[PDB]
Amino acid sequence: PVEQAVLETFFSHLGIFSYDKAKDNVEKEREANKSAGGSWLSLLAALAHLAAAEKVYHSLTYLGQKDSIRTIYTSLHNELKKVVTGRGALGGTAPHVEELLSHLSEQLCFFVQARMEIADFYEKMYTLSTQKFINAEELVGLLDAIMKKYSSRFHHPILSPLESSFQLEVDVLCHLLKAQAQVSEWKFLPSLVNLHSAHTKLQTWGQIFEKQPPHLFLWLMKLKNMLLAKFSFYFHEALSRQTTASEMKTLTAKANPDFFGKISSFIRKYDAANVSLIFDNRGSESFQGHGYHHPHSYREAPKGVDQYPAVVSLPSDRPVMHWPNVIMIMTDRTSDLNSLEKVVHFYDDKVQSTYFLTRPEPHFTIVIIFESKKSERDSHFISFLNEVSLALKNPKVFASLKPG
Amino acid sequence: RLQFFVVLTSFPRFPPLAAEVGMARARLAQLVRLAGGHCRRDTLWKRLFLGRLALAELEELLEAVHAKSIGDIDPQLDCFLSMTVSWYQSLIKVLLSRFPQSCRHFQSPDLGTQYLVVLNQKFTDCFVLVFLDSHLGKTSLTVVFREPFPVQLVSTYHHLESVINTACFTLWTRLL
Numbered sequence: 001p002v003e004q005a006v007l008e009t010f011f012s013h014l015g016i017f018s019y020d021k022a023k024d025n026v027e028k029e030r031e032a033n034k035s036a037g038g039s040w041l042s043l044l045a046a047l048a049h050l051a052a053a054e055k056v057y058h059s060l061t062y063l064g065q066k067d068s069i070r071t072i073y074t075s076l077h078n079e080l081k082k083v084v085t086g087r088g089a090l091g092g093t094a095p096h097v098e099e100l101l102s103h104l105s106e107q108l109c110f111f112v113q114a115r116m117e118i119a120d121f122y123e124k125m126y127t128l129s130t131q132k133f134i135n136a137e138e139l140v141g142l143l144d145a146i147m148k149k150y151s152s153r154f155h156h157p158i159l160s161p162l163e164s165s166f167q168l169e170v171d172v173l174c175h176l177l178k179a180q181a182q183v184s185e186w187k188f189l190p191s192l193v194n195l196h197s198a199h200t201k202l203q204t205w206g207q208i209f210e211k212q213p214p215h216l217f218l219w220l221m222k223l224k225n226m227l228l229a230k231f232s233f234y235f236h237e238a239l240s241r242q243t244t245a246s247e248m249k250t251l252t253a254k255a256n257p258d259f260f261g262k263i264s265s266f267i268r269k270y271d272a273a274n275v276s277l278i279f280d281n282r283g284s285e286s287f288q289g290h291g292y293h294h295p296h297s298y299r300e301a302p303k304g305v306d307q308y309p310a311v312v313s314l315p316s317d318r319p320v321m322h323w324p325n326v327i328m329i330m331t332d333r334t335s336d337l338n339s340l341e342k343v344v345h346f347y348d349d350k351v352q353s354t355y356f357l358t359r360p361e362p363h364f365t366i367v368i369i370f371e372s373k374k375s376e377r378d379s380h381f382i383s384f385l386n387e388v389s390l391a392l393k394n395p396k397v398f399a400s401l402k403p404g
Numbered sequence: 405r406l407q408f409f410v411v412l413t414s415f416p417r418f419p420p421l422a423a424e425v426g427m428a429r430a431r432l433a434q435l436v437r438l439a440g441g442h443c444r445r446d447t448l449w450k451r452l453f454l455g456r457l458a459l460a461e462l463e464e465l466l467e468a469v470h471a472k473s474i475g476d477i478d479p480q481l482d483c484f485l486s487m488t489v490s491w492y493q494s495l496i497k498v499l500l501s502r503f504p505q506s507c508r509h510f511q512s513p514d515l516g517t518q519y520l521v522v523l524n525q526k527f528t529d530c531f532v533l534v535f536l537d538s539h540l541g542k543t544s545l546t547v548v549f550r551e552p553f554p555v556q557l558v559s560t561y562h563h564l565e566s567v568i569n570t571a572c573f574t575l576w577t578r579l580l
Binding site: 188189192193195196197199228238239242243251254255291292293294295297 | 478480483502561564565568569570572573575576577579580
C-alpha cells in the first residue's frame with residue numbers, strides 16, 4: 001500500500017523516543033492530499049493524538065494531581081475504533097485493504113488499555129512511596145498479572161518496535177521488582193540474575209540518545225544504581241574473599257550510594273569497635289552460609305545467636321564477648337526500632353560497650369558498637385543511622401517518580 | 405602371551421569341551437580388548453592429575469569420558485548459557501590470574517579453543533571443564549567425571565559451588 005511508508009515512519013520512529021517528527025507529518029499526510037477515503041484521515045488524526053498522548057504518558061508529570069492519562073486514553077481507543085468500522089462507501093481507498101488497519105486499531109486499543117493500567121499501577125506505587133517500607137512480592141504478582149493480561153494479543157509487524165520497547169521497560173521493572181524483593185529477602189543469586197537481566201535489557205531499551213531521554217529513563221537508572229549499591233553492601237563479605245584488600249576497595253568506591261566508603265570513613269570518626277549489619281532471617285530454613293550451594297544440599301537449622309548473624313561485620317570480626325549484651329535487645333525495646341526510625345543507646349559497668357540500632361527494613365538492622373561513654377558523639381550516630389535507613393529504603397527516588 | 409586351562413568336572417563308570425573352550429576364548433579375548441581400551445583412560449587420567457598433558461591428546465579422555473553439561477545437572481544455573489564469549493574470557497583470565505595450581509591449562513595452538521579446567525586436589529574423577537571456542541562460536545561448561553555416574557555427589561557439589569562462586573564474581577564485576 002501507499003500509506004506503508006507513512007506507517008513505517010510513524011511506527012519505528014516513535015520507538016526511539018521521538019514523537020514530534022512523526023506527529024507533525026501525521027496530519028500532513030492527510031491534509032496535503034485533501035481527497036482521501038476509508039480511514040486515511042481519521043486514522044492519521046488518531047495517530048497524532050496517540051503520539052501526543054504517549055508523550056504526555058512518558059512525561060510522568062501526571063502523578064497525584066490533587067485531566068489524567070486515563071482521561072486522554074479513554075478517547076484514544078474510540079479515535080481508532082470509529083475509523084476502523086464497516087464504512088461501505090462514501091470514502092474509498094481500495095476494495096482489498098479499505099480498513100486494513102482495523103486489526104491494528106484493535107491492537108492499539110489493547111496497547112492503550114495496557115498503558116492506562118500500567119499508569120494506574122505506577123500511580124498506586126507512587127501512593128505507596130510515602131510508606132516507610134513497601135513490600136515487593138505483591139507488586140510483583142500484580143505486574144505479572146498485567147504481563148499475562150497484556151501478552152501477545154496486539155502484535156502486527158509494524159507494531160514490532162513498540163511491542164518490544166514497552167515490554168522491555170516493563171520486564172526491566174519486573175527484574176527490578178523481584179530484585180527489590182530478592183535483595184530484601186537476601187536472595188543473592190536471584191537478585192544478581194535479575195539485576196544483570198535488567199541491565200542488559202536497559203542497554204537495549206535506552207539506546208536512542210546516540211543513534212533528551214524521558215524522566216522514566218533517569219528514574220530507572222537511579223533505581224538500578226540504588227539496587228546495585230544495596231546489593232554490594234548487603235553481599236560484601238563473600239565477594240571480599242575472592243579478591244585482595246584493595247581491589248574490593250576500588251570496586252566498592254564506584255557504586256553510589258557508597259555504603260562501604262561512608263562506613264570506612266565514619267569508623268575512624270569515633271574509633272569504634274565494630275560495625276555489623278544483622279539480618280532477621282527467622283521463619284526460613286534455606287539459610288546455610290554466605291554464598292551459593294546446590295539446591296538439594298542437606299544443612300542444619302539456626303538456633304539462638306545464629307538466628308541473628310553479623311554478615312558484614314567490620315573492620316575485623318564480630319565480637320564474641322560483647323555479643324550477648326547486644327543480642328537480647330533485638331526484641332526487648334525493639335518497639336521503637338519497628339518504626340524504622342529510632343536509635344538505641346547503651347552503657348555497661350567497667351566497660352564502654354554501647355550499641356546503636358537502626359532498622360531500615362524489618363529483616364535488617366545496624367547495631368554499630370562503640371567503646372566510649374563521654375558525650376554520645378553529639379548524636380551524630382543517630383543522624384547517620386537515619387540517613388542510612390532512608391538511603392536503604394530509598395524513598396527519595398519513588399518521590400522523585402514525578403519530574404523535579 | 406598367556407596360557408589358559410579349561411576343566412570340566414561333575415566314581416568312574418568332547419563336543420561340550422570344544423564349545424566351552426571356544427566360548428571361554430571369545431569371552432577372554434573381548435575382556436582383554438575392553439581392559440586394554442579402558443586402562444588407557446585411567447593411566448592418562450592419573451598422568452593429568454599428577455604434567456606432559458598434550459592438548460591434542462587430552463581430547464581423547466573427553467571423548468571417552470561422559471561429561472555432563474551444566475544445563476543438565478541444574479536448571480537454576482541455566483542463565484549462564486546466555487553469557488557471551490567475552491564473559492568466559494573474563495572468567496578464564498580472573499581464575500587463571502588468581503587461583504593456584506588447582507587450575508590446569510589446555511589450549512589449542514592455532515585459531516582454536518582453550519581449556520582452563522579446575523579440579524579439587526582431592527575430588528577425583530569429578531572435574532569442571534571450560535569450553536571456549538570463539539572461532540566456532542561454541543562455549544560450553546560441563547562437569548567431567550572419570551567414571552559413569554549412577555547419581556560422590558557431596559564432593560561433586562562441593563567444588564561445583566566453589567567454582568560457580570567465581571562465575572558470579574566475574575559477572576558481578578561486569579555488572580559494576
